[PDB]
């Protein structure tokens, strides 16, 4: 029924992905339109090819260490070898024209080899194939992603908000997540997974057209090995690493529909600040020098933006809801402070750790009975706010050290601390929320 439309609707029109998507919703891909719709996913029509004005044989200093690898995918494939060497030179000439095009050098640790063999297997012409690559390359694959930097920070900091338990085991036993989940991020699973479930996921990621996807997907693989990982604390790291690299592997075609409801599922428990504030990660590195002073290698947690916390809270319709806490001292409190949001003198935590401890006592009490009422103050997620200058909010370090070792979910940041919810409010001009008595920021 919807088969017939999708032949069709591919024909003619020139149609965009969103339309496309309606007739799909989530069925099985035909083998034959899958190159199209592949196409029109990675927004590659009628795209002209490249290597025919580049006109150049295979010559670079690493040109070597680039034979080898392409001759390991066609041998591991054992393809019909009447037509094996036409594909060895088209994707030989992919790479090279790739590390020509950009200054970038080649190197065997790149996870670029295995995101050509789902493109192979469906048999494109070389030109299609360099605009597929090229294109998912800079949409959906992280440029810090070979280096091992920001792109695995921020994994941490996911696994920390949903399951901070298995993250404390993980930072104990300095396994990061750059170890296991390298060519997991690298090749979109495409190194491990069998070409009929890589294409599955490829078929469902592509139709979604979400860069972050993979950090759920990624998170779902890792936490179904949680039982396996904290249960054996006999092997060494190396043997760990080496169990969780080829988890994917594990997978099957009828694994993969729940894979990505799960997804879906703790995605729609993670606020939207994930997203939005690491764009810079996939785009150009020159966007993401305005957010100064936001490292993901110093983050102790994930950095929630001023804006969510006062849009999220007013919703009231099952979302991402969060219980903001003061950390600043009684002074610098009283002068001005979010209305909703539950006092933790900080200065309590080593000063007199018994009353803060009683105060740690009230503070998860509220959160309960705030949740209860359905209040604006009310929600699951716990957002530490401090003063947002980087001269006093040392403490920082400490509440949030508190509430990790605890393995508490849910536990973030305030991203600018208060002066930053000043600011927001000033650049908007908004006192307080539509509904309601009161504004944002109060004295008492």
């Not at 200058?389 to 305030?414: C, G, T």
Request: charged letters at 20%.
């Amino acid at each position: 029924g919807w088969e017939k439309d999708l032949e069709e609707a591919l024909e003619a029109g020139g149609c965009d992905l969103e339309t496309l998507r309606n007739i799909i919703q989530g069925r099985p891909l035909p083998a034959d339109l899958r190159a199209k719709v592949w196409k029109i996913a990675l927004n590659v029509a009628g795209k002209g090819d490249s290597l025919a004005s580049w006109d150049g044989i295979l010559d670079l200093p690493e040109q070597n260490t680039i034979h080898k690898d392409c001759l390991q995918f066609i041998d591991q494939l054992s393809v019909p070898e009447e037509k094996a060497a036409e594909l060895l030179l088209d994707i030989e000439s992919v790479i090279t024209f790739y590390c020509k095009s950009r200054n970038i050098k080649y190197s065997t640790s790149l996870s670029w080899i295995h995101l050509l063999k789902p493109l192979v297997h469906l048999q494109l012409p070389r030109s299609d194939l360099y605009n597929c690559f090229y294109a998912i390359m800079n949409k959906y694959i992280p440029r810090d992603c070979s280096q091992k930097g920001r792109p695995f920070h921020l994994f941490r900091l996911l696994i920390q908000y949903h399951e901070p338990e298995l993250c404390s085991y993980l930072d104990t036993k300095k396994i990061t997540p750059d170890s296991y989940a390298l060519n997991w991020l690298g090749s979109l699973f495409a190194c491990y997974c069998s070409t009929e479930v890589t294409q599955a996921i490829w078929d469902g990621y592509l139709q979604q057209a979400d860069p972050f996807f993979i950090y759920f997907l990624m998170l779902i693989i890792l936490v179904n090995a949680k039982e396996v990982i904290l249960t054996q604390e006999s092997d060494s790291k190396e043997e760990v690493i080496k169990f969780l690299e080829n988890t994917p592997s594990s997978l099957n075609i009828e694994d993969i529909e729940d894979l990505f409801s799960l997804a879906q599922y703790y995605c729609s428990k993670t606020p939207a600040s994930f997203r939005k504030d690491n764009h810079h990660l996939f785009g150009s590195t020159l966007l993401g020098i305005k957010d100064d002073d936001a490292d993901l290698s110093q983050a102790l947690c994930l950095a929630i933006s001023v804006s969510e916390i006062l849009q999220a809270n007013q919703l009231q319709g099952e979302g991402v809801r969060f219980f903001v806490v003061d950390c600043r001292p009684a002074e610098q409190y009283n002068a001005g402070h979010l209305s909703t949001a539950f006092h933790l003198d900080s200065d309590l935590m080593l000063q007199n750790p018994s009353e803060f401890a009683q105060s740690v006592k009230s503070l998860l009490e509220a959160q309960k009975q705030s949740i209860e009422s359905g209040s604006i103050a009310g929600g699951e997620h716990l957002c530490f706010m401090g003063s947002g200058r980087e001269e006093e909010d040392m403490y920082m370090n400490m509440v949030l050290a508190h509430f990790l070792q605890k393995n508490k979910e849910y536990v973030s940041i305030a991203s600018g601390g208060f002066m930053a919810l000043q600011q927001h409010l000033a650049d908007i001009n908004v006192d307080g929320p539509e509904n309601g008595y009161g504004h944002w920021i109060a004295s008492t």
